[PDB]
Design a protein that fits this description.
This protein is 50% helix and 0% strand. With 10 residues, the chain is an all-alpha fold. It starts with a helix and ends with a helix. Tachykinins are active peptides which excite neurons, evoke behavioral responses, are potent vasodilators and secretagogues, and contract (directly or indirectly) many smooth muscles. One of its GO terms (cellular component) is extracellular region. It is found in: Secreted.
């Protein structure tokens, strides 16, 4: 899931 990766970069 790339959508969950976005939160990790946030």
């Amino acid at each position: 899931a790339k959508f969950d990766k976005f939160y990790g970069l946030m």
